[PDB]
Amino acid sequence: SCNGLYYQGSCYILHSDYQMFSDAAANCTAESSTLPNKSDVMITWLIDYVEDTWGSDGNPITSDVSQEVRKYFCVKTM
């Protein structure tokens, strides 16, 4: 029933609307969700999907970029 990426009991929903960090983080928060945790997803198959989308630390998952827009995943436990 996870319409997105399923990993270790969590469900990652792709939001393809480009948003600034605050707006993305607030969007997930309202959906009872968080942004992805960089260290959780970095050494998994999820990295190919989540790369250069907003992490919970405020940066794109891998110069200053806090004023730019990125896509984002909302993460919610099952």
Epitope: Y18, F21, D57, G58, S63, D64, S66, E68
Partner: antibody
Framework: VKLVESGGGLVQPGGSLTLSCATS????????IYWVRQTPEKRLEWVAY????????YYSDAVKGRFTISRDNAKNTLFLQMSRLKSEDTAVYYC??????????WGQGTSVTVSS | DVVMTQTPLSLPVSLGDQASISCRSS???????????LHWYLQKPGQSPKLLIY???NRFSGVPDRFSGSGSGTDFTLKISRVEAEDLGVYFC??????????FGGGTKLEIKR
């Protein structure tokens, strides 16, 4: 790095006006850009903000629904379409490039005056 | 709706003296990314604003050692170790942590003391 505003002039209330901001010395489509105005009180007030591609736009509450920020990446030019102009919109209008979280390079400005 | 409050409005300084300008935000400017997005601009008469210091304490290109930014959270300071004639004009602090809107301090006019 250069940014040059133009199109500033005298308009009547309810009138319309388009400002331009020609750029030089950097790859234009790689940079997000602001419009910032300086009031007669000489205060700085943010107006609008556009993404590098132009897919995202943001407006201050005071110009929301009246002003339109757009860009032409082929012409290295930024635009500010102003409609339903009020005396409150009287200002010097600056375009400013975003870098490092800040506004690193500004044009010389173009002057707008709304009066009957 | 982050209010930037600058003091003083005018700062009378003589040449060679140190100057310090205060800028205070209505809420903390610490970004979840660890950085703090407070910036300082200088506007000379008949000129547009130019960037002096970005992210609290980083001097922009061509900006001399005598300008130093500091502070944290809600309280920030611009220091000019020794005031020169070319420094005269209006200094503006700005925040880009809680956006939109991007907001500016009211400004501090550096002036000659006689």
């Amino acid at each position: 790095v250069k940014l040059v505003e133009s199109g500033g002039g005298l308009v009547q209330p309810g009138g319309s006006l388009t400002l331009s901001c020609a750029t030089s010395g950097f790859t234009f489509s790689d940079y997000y850009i602001y419009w910032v105005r300086q009031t007669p009180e000489k205060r700085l007030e943010w107006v609008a903000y556009i993404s590098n591609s132009g897919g995202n736009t943001y407006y201050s509450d005071a110009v929301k629904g009246r002003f339109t920020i757009s860009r032409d990446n082929a012409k290295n030019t930024l635009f500010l379409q102003m409609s339903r102009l009020k005396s409150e919109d009287t200002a010097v209008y600056y375009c400013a490039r975003q870098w490092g979280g800040a506004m690193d390079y500004w044009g010389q400005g173009t002057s707008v005056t709304v009066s009957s | 709706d982050v209010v930037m409050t600058q003091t003083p409005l005018s700062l009378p300084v003589s040449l060679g003296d140190q100057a310090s300008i205060s800028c205070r935000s209505s809420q903390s400017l610490i970004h979840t990314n660890g950085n703090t997005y407070l910036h300082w601009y200088l506007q000379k008469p008949g000129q547009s604003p130019k960037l002096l210091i970005y992210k609290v304490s980083n001097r922009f290109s061509g900006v001399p050692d005598r300008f130093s930014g500091s502070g944290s959270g809600t309280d920030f300071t611009l220091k000019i170790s020794r005031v020169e004639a070319e420094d005269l004009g209006v200094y503006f602090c700005s925040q880009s942590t809680h956006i939109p809107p991007w907001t500016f301090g009211g400004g501090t006019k550096l002036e000659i003391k006689r």
